[PDB]
């Protein structure tokens, strides 16, 4: 009775209880999301607490199975999974006083309270409030109140928490065999043992680096364009030759540019293709619209939807005798359920979601035969991938015509082409260098290449040199604004959207090679194609089985991440940004600055 | 006319677990399989060696019946010549194996809103499993190299696990009652057939 025999018993047993406990914890979960009551809260917290402890209880067993005597490289995975030592390898005043911190931050950050110099009495907060300021307001001075504003009441108490923060963790990441922090967050790509398919935690660096030096002149070309365009609206804040204003972008912290579309629309009197009126002068409802879903997902080959799909999935707003958390979401509950979460209205957004969300679900069941350790994505960035792509092929026209909700004797000019890429670039492309910078200075953080007396400092011109943003008033040491975002206050990882960004159109240029389309990329279709299905299927039902190097190549035909497929997506917006960009500079200059 | 009564196992009330299988023998009587067709609804009726039309006409010396419920996703190993956790430690069926299975959903009745965990089954075993043999056993398995005494935990567990039904469940994971049919013809004269 070797290990291997050990290893795989202890799985079994794993296997057979974990589905039970984690089938209640969802139950309770969901039963709290339909209706708000303080008994499903408790029950809520009873199922978690049962499902911590056993997790907790069977990983401290775990670790009884040393690595290097177990040669499956499946079972291998589940016990790797299994045996992160996390917080527990701390004595008990740093984690309790790590978890006390983490509190205080998620707190400060939640009840951010930010109020003007005139009136306490009446003062916003950040959503609403400062949200709806910095996104529908077009007066230069009111939002620079607020960009500040949010960045010294709550930026200042966060600051000597996270410098407290930032050593437990790395006192952590040292106790579990790492390096920084930093290093195990890139721990979720990394691959050993199988040959040809490794890839080292450093590999992702070099690799991201790689990745933005050939996104960079299209960066460029729009950030010209937006330049010269913003230059309208505000004529005496921004120079032809410079960086950006940081709070002019219409968003809290720039991640996305998506509200600066009706400053920098194409063609104005074009619109864009609406299909709420013709939805809503056809009788159309939310069942027709998931009923719509299915019938195209099943045109590529995917199975339908379960009959307990159904009947246990609430896909309205029961209205104000219920109480209802309305966030799309798809649920697994294991054990052959699936659900889905929205309180669904007659919308195109509505619909477009309704594929995202269901192709979720459809991932979800790919793999509903794998072990429980191993049902999920290859990686953190290859499940929202696929609800993209199946959302961006019934966007199409095309898609619209054949369902009826468009004319048939539409005919589609070349401006509402550059009005749909250009919204498209503003959200997909614009977002990209600030995940870079965010991640960049992370990892110089947790490794100790800046010092603690220079993080504002590293931050501003990395956000000068990288994005392209310039601060509207100078920060001394005191602050912290990277704690201003969500997912730094919160601990979580950031790398993750660049990563899916990426893949997703890789994804899609092979299922649209697979279906023998000819034209632009952007104009696909994947309904109607058997072979597109199968092809993508083949990597859907993996799970984590395989190094996601693997899982890539079985759909892209390729080892590693690349950018050629995102590039040939944009290549008629790139043109006509080139053609437009001929009067105007291309670039951007560190030196200059509002408050110079 | 006696009537062999094949309808007090296909109807009773409750069913017993996949490892401890109840047994219940046919004779002295006419069969009437006319009978059987009720309940329309199966999910899977598969015949193996005779066939469900000339069946009427034959008389052979016993006939058993076994009785027991298992999950959707595991009927498929009450066929001869398959492997799995059910087909080698619970219940195996012989290569020259001669009659029918009969399967159909039971959510209605044998699932419950907080969970069913009244039928188990055999998850580990030292050793497989002979045709047409039962196991109550319910001694510590040991999975290690150290003498366990009887105790959970460490290398130790218990065999039998719970199913735990649910009546959300998915169509593979919602109970399936099961019932095979097995004939034999021995030297004595054969009495039990219908007219
Ligand atoms: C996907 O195909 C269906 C079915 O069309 C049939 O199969 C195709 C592969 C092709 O061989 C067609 O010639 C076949 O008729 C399409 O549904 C039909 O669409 C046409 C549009 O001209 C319409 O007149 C029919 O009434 C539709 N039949 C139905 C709804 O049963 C569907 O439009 C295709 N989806 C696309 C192209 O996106
Ligand atoms: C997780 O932590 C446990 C203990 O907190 C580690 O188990 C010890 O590992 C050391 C490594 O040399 C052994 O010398 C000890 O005998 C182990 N047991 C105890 C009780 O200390 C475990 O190794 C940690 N996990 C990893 C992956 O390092
Ligand atoms: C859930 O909401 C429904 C809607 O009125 C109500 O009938 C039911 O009692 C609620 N459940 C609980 C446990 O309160
Ligand atoms: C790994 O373990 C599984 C568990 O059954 C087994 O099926 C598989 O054959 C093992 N891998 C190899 C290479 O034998
Ligand atoms: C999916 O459902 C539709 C309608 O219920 C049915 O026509 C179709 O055959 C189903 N597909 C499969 C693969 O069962
Ligand atoms: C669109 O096509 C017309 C056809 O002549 C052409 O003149 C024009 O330059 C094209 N591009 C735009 C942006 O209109
Ligand atoms: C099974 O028993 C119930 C309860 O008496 C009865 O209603 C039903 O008809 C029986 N089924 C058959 C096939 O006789
Ligand atoms: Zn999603």
Redesign the pocket.
């Given at each position: 009775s070797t290990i291997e025999e050990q290893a795989?018993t202890f799985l079994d047993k794993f296997n057979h209880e974990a589905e039970d406990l984690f089938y209640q914890s969802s139950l309770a979960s969901w039963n709290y999301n339909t209706n708000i009551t303080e008994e499903n809260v408790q029950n809520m917290n009873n199922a978690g607490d049962k499902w911590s402890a056993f997790l907790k209880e069977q990983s401290t067993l775990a670790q009884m199975y040393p690595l290097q005597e177990i040669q499956?490289?499946?079972?291998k995975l589940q016990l790797q999974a299994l045996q992160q030592n996390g917080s527990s390898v701390l004595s008990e005043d740093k984690s309790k006083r790590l978890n006390t911190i983490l509190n205080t931050m998620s707190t400060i950050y939640s009840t951010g309270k930010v109020c003007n110099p005139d009136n306490p009495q009446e003062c916003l907060l950040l959503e609403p409030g400062l949200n709806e300021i910095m996104a529908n307001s077009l007066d230069y001075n009111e939002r620079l109140w607020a960009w500040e504003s949010w960045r010294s009441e709550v930026g200042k108490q966060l600051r000597p928490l996270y410098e407290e923060y930032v050593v437990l963790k790395n006192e952590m990441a040292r106790a579990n065999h790492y390096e920084d922090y930093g290093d195990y967050w890139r721990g979720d790509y990394e691959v050993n043992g199988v040959d040809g398919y490794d890839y080292s935690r450093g590999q992702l660096i070099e690799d991201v680096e790689h990745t933005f030096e050939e996104i960079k002149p299209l960066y460029e070309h729009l950030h010209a364009y937006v330049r010269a365009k913003l230059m309208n609206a505000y004529p005496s804040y921004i120079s032809p030759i410079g960086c950006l204003p940081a709070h002019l972008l219409g968003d809290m912290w720039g991640r996305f540019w998506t509200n600066l579309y009706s400053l920098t629309v194409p063609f104005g009197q074009k619109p864009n293709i609406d299909v709420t009126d013709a939805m809503v002068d056809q009788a159309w409802d939310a069942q027709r619209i998931f009923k719509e879903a299915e019938k195209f997902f099943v045109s590529v080959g995917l199975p339908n939807m379960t009959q307990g799909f159904w009947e246990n999935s609430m896909l309205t707003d029961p209205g104000n005798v219920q109480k209802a958390v309305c966030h799309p979401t798809a649920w697994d509950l294991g054990k052959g359920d699936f659900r889905i979460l929205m309180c669904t209205k007659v919308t195109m957004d509505d619909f477009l979601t309704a594929h995202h969300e269901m192709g979720h679900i459809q991932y979800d069941m790919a793999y509903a035969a794998q072990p429980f350790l191993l049902r999920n994505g290859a990686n953190e960035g290859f499940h929202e991938a696929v609800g993209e792509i199946m959302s961006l092929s019934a966007a199409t026209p095309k898609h619209l015509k054949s369902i009826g909700l468009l004319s048939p004797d539409f005919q589609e000019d070349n401006e509402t082409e550059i009005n749909f890429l250009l919204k498209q670039a503003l959200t997909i492309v614009g977002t990209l260098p600030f995940t870079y910078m965010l991640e960049k200075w992370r990892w110089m953080v947790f490794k100790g290449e800046i010092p603690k007396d220079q993080w504002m400092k590293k931050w501003w011109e990395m956000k000068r040199e990288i994005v392209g943003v310039v601060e509207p008033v100078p920060h001394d040491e005191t602050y912290c604004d990277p704690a201003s975002l969500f997912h730094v206050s919160n601990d979580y990882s950031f790398i993750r959207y660049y990563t899916r960004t990426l893949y997703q159109f890789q994804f899609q240029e092979a299922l649209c090679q697979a279906a023998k389309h000819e034209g632009p990329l952007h104009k696909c279709d994947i309904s109607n194609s058997t072979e597109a299905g199968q092809k993508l299927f083949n990597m859907l039902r993996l799970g984590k089985s395989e190094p996601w190097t693997l899982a890539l190549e079985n759909v892209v035909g390729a080892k590693n991440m690349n950018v050629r497929p995102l590039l040939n997506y944009f290549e008629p917006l790139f043109t006509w940004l080139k053609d437009q960009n001929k009067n105007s500079f291309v670039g951007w200059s560190t030196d200059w600055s509002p408050y110079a | 006319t006696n009537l062999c009564p094949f309808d007090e196992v296909f109807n009773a009330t409750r069913f017993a677990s996949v490892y401890a299988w109840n047994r219940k023998r046919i004779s002295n009587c006419v069969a009437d399989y006319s009978v059987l067709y009720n309940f329309a609804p199966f999910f899977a009726f598969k015949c193996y060696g005779v066939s469900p039309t000339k069946l009427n006409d034959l008389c052979f010396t016993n006939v058993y019946a076994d009785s027991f419920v298992i999950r959707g996703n595991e009927v498929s190993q009450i066929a001869p010549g398959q492997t799995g956790n059910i087909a080698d430690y619970n219940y195996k069926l012989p290569d020259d194996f001669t009659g029918c299975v009969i399967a159909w959903n039971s959510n209605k009745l044998d699932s419950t809103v907080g969970g069913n965990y009244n039928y188990r089954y055999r998850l580990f075993r030292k050793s497989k499993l002979k045709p047409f043999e039962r196991d109550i056993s319910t001694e510590i398995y040991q999975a290690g190299n150290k003498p366990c005494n009887g105790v959970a935990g460490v290398n130790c567990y218990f065999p039998l696990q719970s199913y735990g039904f649910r009546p959300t469940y998915g169509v593979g994971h919602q109970p399936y009652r099961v019932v095979v049919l097995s004939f034999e013809l021995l030297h004595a004269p054969a009495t039990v057939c219908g007219p």
């Open positions: 795989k499956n490289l499946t079972v | -």
